[PDB]
Each structure stands twice: as structure tokens, then as C-alpha cells.
């Protein structure tokens, strides 16, 4: 039964490759015995005695010495030793593998209403994964007495089934996992709650740990069963325990993409707005006012605050007075828990500061305070990021005005370099390099121009025209670290520039157009080279990093903190790692 | 519940011969190919001095 001959469909059978090698060594031994009996000449005795050794070696592991035997299908047979080695073998395949039971998998969707410890669960997969628990509770409940009874009553989905299911999973956490599991945050525990439909929902604030996005990724889900297990998942594995990353103390649940857009948007300022310079006593006042529709949310007002603040040394001193704030920021005053100073919210709130808020909260106020704060931060950022209707047209991408002449200068200098060459007055390689530098510097200039061409807007405000920070869409999407970077803006409004042929040696013709303006056939063709190269380079890496982390896990798989103190008195000497130009790490 | 098979003439466990270094070779203090020749019925070798 480790080399079976089970019959399967088509009235046929499925031997194992071992049966054949056995069936060969056997009758070779038999013929050998018959020969030794009949007293044959020693030549054929030798031939049999050698054929036997060959079959034995094939059985043990064929291919070690010869041209390993094959069956009709002409495959090299799967010998004995070939079962306990290799990735498809026996050790790292079925001893650390083990397709398990009580599991399921489907497509993920967002569900921005949950809390940081919940997840949607299609009632079908729930009915399936918990079925025996349902059986037990029905039997004990007195609605069925046998097992065939309960199985026949669940097959037709009685109404009481849904209620008893919902009470089964009141506090029975599950696990969730995404396929390439690189770090321990690749697995966390949530508490389900029934949903209709056929897709898993998970709180958005964790899609950074699982490194997931909703273009089709599918997650698996396993259930714990025991009393120790489904308590170990609760205490060591629930999402509300994993705030900071094991790699570095930096938090991992910071708002990410347009939770940041809304915050940064409602936390800016404007000079001449409605209701400017007004007076308000408390947050509820500003709320009542703003809902009435008279004030502009970016206005500057004066709020009188009074609340405790925690000092470094465990003190807690009172803070009061009048502070010059903005209508927007005061709207965030409600969520800040008592214990943190208002000085955190009283700025423009780009991402690097939201993370600051969360870190500060954790280190002084606790852990639960931080998850509740992130709750409210998401709940608010989502709200105000749609009353602002941010969107993106094409006129929001503004081409700078001096582009044509800035190109003319460059191409004229290029003609001059070609002149210096054509009369053999200059060599080749130097011409090439100087052309490269020409195009590079001019592209840099035309790129730096659109920054001022899109991040500044002048207006003849009452009295005169003064320049102010623009409220442009595409500028805000990247000055708030929400989603973007300066380079993409360049390639949208500026010019592409230098495209490296496969090696990396730049092409002596740069692309002068840009995406808002489109490209000619040749200009697109020149880019597809690097496009394909960079695209192919990831797929031909995805196996390498896994290789290295596998090696490393092997090297140190058995390092465990076992004792409080080792008592010794020797270590190392640390110092700020200067690099002749900067400290770069204090 | 295993079984077994009776071998008329003994036969060398391939592993301890072609595992590099060959434990048979290291034991008998001879180079491998010299052993395989004996094994492949290509020479003889003094067993009785």
C-alpha cells in the first residue's frame, strides 16, 4: 500500500514505478538461479550477474551511474531514493506541507465599515467551515437527535440554522493569510461576522501588512479548534496586537492612500475666506457653525481649548488658552483622546505626521488608545475626502510655457556639436557624452519648471496679486505623500528624456514629448525596450529573495531567548556611522 | 508489514560506492575506477595472499 495498483476510471489501473523495478529485479534473480542450476558457460553467468547489479542500482536510485531506465512514455522512472529528496519529494513536500482541512479561499473586497478586529465572511463558507460545531449545537439544542437528522436538515438550509450559526461564532476567531507569506504579519487573526455575498471583506488599514490590493488577490482562511489554540490566536495573533513592525518600531496601520488626501485637504489654510477671524468656545460650536454652510472649511478662526497633556516623565499638566487654528483642524479635535496635546493636530498633516501621531499615541497612552484613534482617523478621513469631490481632469496637468524655446536652445547646441564633429574637429565618444549631458541638463530644467507651473497660483486678491500655494488636484495628490512622486509628474507634464537601451547605455536621441501630448511611433518604440526589461526583471527575481530567506531561516532556525541574564560583561563599540559627508545615522 | 527477496549472489549497495567520497574506496584505499573495474567483471584481485 505504498506502491499501490488501484484500479481507476476507464477500466484501467495505475501502477507505481517501483512495481516495475521490483518486477524486474525479481525475474532477473530467478533466471540467475536457474542458470547457476543448469551449469551454463561462465560468460552468460557473468552477463546475468551483471544485469542483476544494474537492476538493483536502478531500483535504489537510477541515474547515479548510467542512462537511467525509462518506461514506455520515455520518462526517467521515479526510483526509491528519488522520493525523499527534491522540492517535490517527501521531506519539504508532505512533512512541512500538509494540505489541511477546515479551510477556504475567495476574493477579497474592502468593507470600510468594519473595526480593526473584524472581517466579512460569506455565510456559505461559514456554514461549511463550522459544520460540525453546528451539528453539536443542533443536537444539544434538541432540534435533531441523530447525525443523519442534522445533516438532512442542513442540506436544505432551515431558518434556525442561520441563527445557531451566528451564535456559534460569537467569539471564535479565524485566521487569514495571503499566498506569498514573507513575514509574521502575513498571518493575523480576526473575528468574523456574517455577510451575504461571496467575497471576504477586510478592514483597509491592514492591507499594507498582507501587502494586498483589490485587483483580484485571494485570501485563505483557517479555523482553530481547541481551547488552547483559539485562545493563542486571541492573545498572540489578533490584529489589535500588531501595531508596530517587528523589523523596526515604526507602526504599520497608518492611513495610506486617500484617507491621507482628505486629512491633508481639510487641514490647510486660506487667506481671504468667509467667517475669517471668528471666535468659538468648543468643538461643538465649530461643528454647528460649519454644518450651517456659512464658513469655508479652510478659514482661520480662534478656539479656546482646555485639556490635560502627558509629559515625558509621567506628569500630566493642564493646558489652556486661546489658539489660532483653522476650521478644518478643529473638526479633528473630537477624535484626539484626552492625553495628547493639540500641538499634534495643529499643522498641515501630511503622511509623515499622521504616522507621528500614531507613534506618539502608542508610546505614551497605551495600545488600545492607538487602535481606537486609528479607527476615528479612518472614519473621518473617508468622510471629508468625498465632500471635497477631489478629481482629476486633463487641464489639471499644466505644461510649462517656456518649453519650446528651452528645447530650441538644446537642439541648436546639438547642431553645434555635430558641426564640431563633421569637420573632424572633435572625436566621437566625447561628442556622444556631451550630447548626453546637454539633453540631461535641459530636461532637468524643463522638469523643474512645471513644479512652479503647477504648485503656485497667483490671484489679484483684495489689494493685489500675490502667489499662494495651489489647490491643484495632481499637486495635492503628491505633496501629501498619498500616491505619487515627482518623477511621474515630470513624465506627465515635462518630458520623458533619456531611454536606456537594454544594457543601460543611453540613446543619443531623447524623447521630447510627454504623455499629455502623446508620442510618435519611433518615440514609443524606443521606450518599449526598457519597459520590457524592467518588467521582466521582477519575475526573474521573485524566486531569488525567497531563496535567500530560506537559507537564512535554516542558518538560525534554532535561536530562542531562554534565560534572563548571561552575566557576561563584553560587547561592541558603537558610534555614529559617518560617511565623510554626513552622519546618516546618529 | 514488509517482506524480502533472496539474492543468489551478493550485490553492492550503490550509495556507499558512488557518494563522493566513496566509503568503499576510502576503506579499501583504492581509487574508485579501479574498484568499478573489479565490480564490472573487468579484472581480478588477489584475495588470498
Amino acid at each position: 500500500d505504498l506502491r499501490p495498483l488501484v484500479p481507476i476510471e476507464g477500466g484501467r489501473f495505475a501502477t507505481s514505478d517501483l512495481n516495475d523495478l521490483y518486477r524486474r529485479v525479481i525475474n532477473r534473480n530467478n533466471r540467475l538461479k536457474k542458470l547457476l542450476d543448469l551449469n551454463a558457460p561462465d560468460i552468460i553467468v557473468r552477463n546475468e550477474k551483471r544485469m542483476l547489479q544494474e537492476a538493483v542500482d536502478a531500483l535504489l536510485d537510477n541515474g547515479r551511474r548510467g542512462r537511467a531506465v525509462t518506461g514506455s512514455n520515455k520518462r526517467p522512472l521515479k526510483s526509491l531514493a528519488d522520493m525523499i529528496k527534491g522540492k517535490q519529494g517527501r521531506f519539504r513536500q508532505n512533512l512541512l506541507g500538509k494540505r489541511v482541512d477546515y479551510s477556504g479561499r475567495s476574493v477579497i473586497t474592502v468593507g470600510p465599515s468594519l473595526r480593526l478586529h473584524e472581517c466579512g465572511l460569506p455565510k456559505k463558507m461559514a456554514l461549511e467551515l463550522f459544520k460540525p460545531f453546528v451539528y453539536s449545537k443542533l443536537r444539544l439544542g434538541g432540534h435533531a437527535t441523530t447525525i443523519k437528522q442534522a445533516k438532512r436538515m442542513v442540506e436544505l438550509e432551515e431558518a434556525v440554522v442561520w441563527d445557531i450559526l451566528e451564535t456559534v461564532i460569537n467569539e471564535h476567531p479565524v485566521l487569514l493569510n495571503r499566498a506569498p507569506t514573507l513575514h509574521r504579519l502575513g498571518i493575523q487573526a480576526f473575528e468574523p461576522r456574517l455577510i451575504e455575498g461571496k467575497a471576504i471583506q477586510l478592514h483597509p488599514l491592514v492591507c499594507a501588512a498582507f501587502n494586498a490590493d483589490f485587483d483580484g488577490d485571494q485570501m485563505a482562511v483557517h479555523v482553530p479548534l481547541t481551547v488552547e489554540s483559539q485562545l493563542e490566536a486571541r492573545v498572540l495573533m489578533m490584529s489589535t496586537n500588531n501595531i508596530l513592525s517587528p523589523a523596526s518600531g515604526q507602526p504599520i496601520i497608518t492611513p495610506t492612500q486617500d484617507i491621507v488626501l482628505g486629512l491633508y485637504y481639510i487641514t490647510r489654510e486660506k487667506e481671504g475666506a468667509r467667517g475669517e477671524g471668528k471666535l468659538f468656545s468648543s468643538y461643538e460650536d465649530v461643528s454647528r457653525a460649519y454644518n450651517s454652510g456659512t464658513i469655508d472649511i479652510h478659514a482661520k478662526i480662534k478656539l479656546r481649548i482646555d485639556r490635560q497633556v502627558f509629559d515625558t516623565k509621567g506628569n500630566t499638566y493642564n493646558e489652556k488658552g486661546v489658539v489660532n487654528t483653522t476650521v478644518g483642524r478643529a473638526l479633528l479635535l473630537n477624535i484626539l483622546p484626552e492625553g495628547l496635546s493639540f500641538s499634534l493636530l495643529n499643522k498641515v498633516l501630511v503622511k509623515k505626521e499622521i504616522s507621528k501621531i500614531i507613534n506618539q499615541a502608542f508610546r505614551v497612552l497605551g495600545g488600545k488608545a492607538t487602535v481606537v484613534l486609528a479607527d476615528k482617523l479612518m472614519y473621518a478621513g473617508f468622510k471629508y475626502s468625498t465632500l471635497s469631490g477631489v478629481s482629476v481632469g486633463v487641464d489639471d496637468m499644466t505644461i510649462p510655457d517656456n518649453k519650446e524655446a528651452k528645447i530650441e536652445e538644446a537642439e541648436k547646441e546639438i547642431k553645434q556639436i555635430t558641426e564640431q564633429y563633421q569637420s573632424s574637429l572633435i572625436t566621437e565618444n566625447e561628442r556622444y557624452n556631451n550630447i548626453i549631458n546637454i539633453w540631461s541638463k535641459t530636461s532637468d530644467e524643463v522638469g523643474a519648471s512645471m513644479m512652479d507651473a503647477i504648485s503656485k497660483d497667483t490671484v489679484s486678491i483684495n489689494g493685489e496679486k500675490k502667489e499662494i500655494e495651489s489647490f491643484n488636484s495632481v499637486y495635492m495628490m503628491a505633496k501629501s505623500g498619498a500616491r505619487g512622486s515627482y518623477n511621474q509628474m515630470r513624465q506627465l507634464a515635462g518630458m520623458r528624456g533619456l531611454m536606456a537601451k537594454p544594457d543601460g547605455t543611453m540613446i543619443e536621441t531623447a524623447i521630447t514629448a510627454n504623455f499629455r501630448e502623446g508620442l510618435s511611433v519611433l518615440q514609443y518604440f524606443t521606450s518599449t525596450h526598457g519597459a520590457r526589461k524592467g518588467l521582466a526583471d521582477t519575475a526573474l527575481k521573485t524566486a531569488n529573495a525567497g531563496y535567500l530567506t530560506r537559507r537564512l531561516v535554516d542558518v538560525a532556525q534554532d535561536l530562542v531567548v531562554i534565560e534572563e541574564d548571561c552575566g557576561t560583561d563584553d560587547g561592541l563599540m558603537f558610534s555614529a556611522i559617518v560617511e565623510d559627508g554626513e552622519v546618516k545615522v546618529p | 508489514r514488509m517482506g524480502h527477496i533472496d539474492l543468489v549472489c551478493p550485490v553492492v549497495h550503490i550509495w556507499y560506492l558512488k557518494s563522493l567520497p566513496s566509503r568503499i574506496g576510502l576503506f579499501l584505499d583504492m581509487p574508485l575506477k579501479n574498484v568499478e573495474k573489479v565490480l564490472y567483471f573487468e579484472s581480478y584481485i588477489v584475495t588470498d595472499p
Partner: peptide, 18 residues
């Protein structure tokens, strides 16, 4: 000749047609 060739069929044909 006795030149390390492993596959037995030759090591038999050689002596066979001697």
C-alpha cells in the same frame, strides 16, 4: 577495450564475437 564503459551490452558483445 576495458575503458570504463559502463553499459553492459557492449561489455558482452565484445567477448561474444571473440
Amino acid at each position: 577495450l576495458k575503458g570504463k564503459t559502463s553499459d553492459p551490452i557492449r561489455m558482452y558483445m565484445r567477448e561474444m564475437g571473440i
